[PDB]
Each structure stands twice: as C-alpha cells, then as structure tokens.
Nucleic acid binder design. Structure first.
Ligand code: NI
Length: 59
DNA sequence: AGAAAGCCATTAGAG
DNA sequence: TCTCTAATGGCTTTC
C-alpha cells in the first residue's frame, strides 16, 4: 500500500543520542545525520518531529 | 516574500 | 491482535 521502514537499533540510538544535545536540527545537521545513518533528510526531519512530540507529553 | 519547517491530530504497517 | 512508531495531511510560524 504505502510502505514503512523500521529503524535499526543503531539508527534509533544515534538519533536519540543527537537529540540529547539538540532538540532541533539545522538543515546542514540533518543532511549530515542522514548520510551517516543511510536515511533521508525528510525521514530525519519527521523523526525529530515525532520524538519532539513524545518529549512534550512526558514533560 | 514564500518555500520550509513546525505543530498536531491522525493514519497504518510491520514485528 | 496488539502495540510501537514511521509516515501523512493541513494548517500556522519561521526566517
Ligand atoms: Ni507569507
């Protein structure tokens, strides 16, 4: 139908690692992480969005 | 300015 | 099936 990719343990970890420092990302930083983890800039953008949403409800 | 990014409510797919 | 979360739509805000 649409499709969905599940993020590896490494990817989710590195992403959660970066989020510990910068809760928001500049465009250059997103391109870096994308290449580093073999993800799309768009996928990195959305991940930080969703992860930001969980951080608001918990706090 | 106006693309881009954010917020947000919501959907749905894979494990 | 059940749950987690990737992914979308539709506005508003940013820069
Ligand atoms: Ni405008």
């Amino acid at each position: 139908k649409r499709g969905r990719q599940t993020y590896t343990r490494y990817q989710t970890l590195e992403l959660e690692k970066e989020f510990h420092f910068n809760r928001y990302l500049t465009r250059r930083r997103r391109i870096e992480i994308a290449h580093a983890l073999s993800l799309t800039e768009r996928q990195i953008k959305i991940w930080f969005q969703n992860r930001r949403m969980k951080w608001k409800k918990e706090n």
